[PDB]
Design a protein around this ligand. Structure first.
Ligand SMILES: Cc1ccccc1/N=C(\c1ccc(O)cc1)c1ccc(O)cc1O
Ligand SMILES: Cc1ccccc1/N=C(\c1ccc(O)cc1)c1ccc(O)cc1O
Lengths: 7, 216, 225, 8
């Protein structure tokens, strides 16, 4: 999730 | 980037104070989890506005946040709790004191102590946003990390630049600097203790928070 | 309080002269942890007497002295390790006769705490950390790690800050280079705190599974629970 | 506690 939110 | 340029960018990047759903141990802790889970979204879009952060890898950004997130929530908590002696303002509508701590009590007192330390020092907002950003960049720094070190040094220049303006002598700037940075050891401690408490709760949570936990 | 009426150079000398000696040791999981526990148990005795020689520490209550050591003992053991491991890149010099690589830590459920330690040592090496700065840092850990869990301690900490700067200005550091290096050194104390916390959990894990712990060593562990 | 005795 954290990766997608950074993106 | 000038020091004054530094402070403005950080000041303008600040996340909003979020509200709770207030009004047992399960209920209260349920509320803090709800709050933390929504704050995390703002934190993530806040980190992007932190100078240097966007210059890092996507993997590195993930690591830094996975390490520092609770530290950042906690220094946020302690800051907005400054003018509320003996209490913790988790949210404008969630103001709590020591005697509803309920395995929390030890963590509560530590947070309460950190806020008293801040108030004693008359911690300024400009200094706070500096500290918080240092936490994001420092807490997981241990290729080009050292661009992070260049930025860390910039933030340190900003702290000192701030202090010189408040009429602090050269000796007073060095001492205050150490005093602020030394507090970050405690925040590290509270965070670690906090993680442990949360690890006990998992084996009785937000899907994002769980992802943030197993990283530890 | 004599600690406040003390110059930077007199502070440095006082700390340098109070340095505990470097002890010697005596791999499976219990073998390695046996030697470390034994070693740590012996250093604690020297640590306690080193602390009584750290300026300002003697003015504190016995109860307070007990608290600061209980909080900082593993931090202090660890920054000691990291320091003497400097001249040995990729290595951990727990004792002169006990030099370990990361591969040895893998025989214990430990490698994560190894790497962090090795990383800290790389940082010290990269910064060219001096002995005078090391003894300052270590005393800072002693007085700071338990202070918020008391004005005397803050005034002694400030004095040590003055000393760290006085050293940097002596080594020819510019004004900007002085406060930048201070923050760099102090920020590493966050990591040592983290390593200590992660160390503690591993020891409580060891204590519930029964390497046998020293009663003194157990007394230190129970303080963090 | 052992610390008490050792510290004195
Ligand atoms: C108080 C506490 C104890 C243990 C672990 C985290 C803790 N803190 C928390 C926290 C985090 C996650 C939880 O499930 C619940 C709470 C916290 C939440 C929001 C905020 O703005 C500041 C915070 O410190
Ligand atoms: C490496 C490590 C991992 C987990 C816990 C403590 C650890 N360190 C230890 C340690 C301490 C106590 C133990 O029972 C056993 C070991 C250590 C011992 C001596 C020393 O001079 C420095 C040290 O860091």
């Amino acid at each position: 999730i954290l990766h997608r939110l950074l993106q | 980037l000038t020091a004054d340029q530094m402070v403005s960018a950080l000041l303008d990047a600040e996340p909003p104070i979020l509200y709770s759903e207030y009004d047992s141990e399960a209920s209260m802790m349920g509320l803090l989890t709800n709050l933390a889970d929504r704050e995390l979204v703002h934190m993530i879009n806040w980190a992007k506005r932190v100078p240097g952060f966007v210059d890092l890898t996507l993997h590195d950004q993930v690591h830094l946040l996975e390490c520092a997130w609770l530290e950042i929530l906690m220094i946020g908590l302690v800051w907005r709790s400054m003018e509320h002696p003996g209490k913790l303002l988790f949210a404008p509508n969630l103001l709590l004191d020591r005697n509803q701590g309920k395995g929390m009590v030890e963590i509560f007192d530590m947070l309460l102590a950190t806020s008293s330390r801040f108030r004693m020092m008359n911690l300024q907002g400009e200094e706070f946003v500096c500290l918080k950003s240092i936490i994001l960049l420092n807490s997981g720094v241990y290729e080009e990390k050292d661009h992070i070190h260049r930025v860390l040094d910039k933030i340190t220049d900003t702290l000192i630049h701030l202090m010189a303006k408040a009429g602090l002598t050269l000796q007073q700037q060095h001492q205050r600097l150490a005093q602020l940075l030394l507090i970050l050891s405690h925040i590290r401690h509270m965070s670690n203790k906090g993680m442990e408490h949360l690890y006990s709760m998992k084996c009785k949570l937000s899907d994002l928070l769980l992802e943030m936990l197993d990283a530890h």
